[model samples]
Target: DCYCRIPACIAGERRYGTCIYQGRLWAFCC
Candidate 1:
């Protein structure tokens, strides 16, 4: 299961996904 928040469009267009990685927040697309 993916433990991340819903994808959002922050900083202009293009959606982005955020999740927890190594006890920290990680952001990426795809």
Candidate 2:
């Protein structure tokens, strides 16, 4: 169970959750 630090999706993007397939950080809508 590892977590990745991905850059912000957009100017005001925030973290929503983790990707079930990729196991990386996920954004709402970028």
Candidate 3:
């Protein structure tokens, strides 16, 4: 599972998404 526990995403945000950018998994806390 590619679960990203980031500071910006792990803040219990409602609207969000993720993507593989620069060969790295990034979670967008939008």
* TM-score top scorer: 3
- Ranking of all predicted structures according to TM-score, beginning with the best and ending with the worst: 3, 2, 1
Clashes of each: 0, 0, 0
**Residue-level error in angstroms, candidate 1, position 27:** 0.1
- Whole-model Cα lDDT of every candidate shown, in order: 0.48, 0.46, 0.54
Whichever of 2 and 3 has more lDDT, that candidate is 3
Residue 18, model 2: lDDT of 53
Name the lDDT of candidate 2: 0.46
Q: For model 2, how does the per-residue alpha-carbon lDDT over 1-30 read when each residue is reduced to its tens digit?
A: 233235545545555565544555554433
Q: Which candidate model has the greater lDDT, 1 or 3? A: 3
lDDT of 3 by residue, 1-30 (tens): 235434346544543566666777667554
The true-versus-predicted C-alpha distance at residue 22 of model 3, in Å, is 1.0
For residue 12, model 3's alpha carbon misses the true position, in angstroms, by 4.5
Candidate 1 on 1-30: residue-level lDDT in tens? Answer: 223343444443443556666777655433
In terms of lDDT, the best-performing candidate is 3
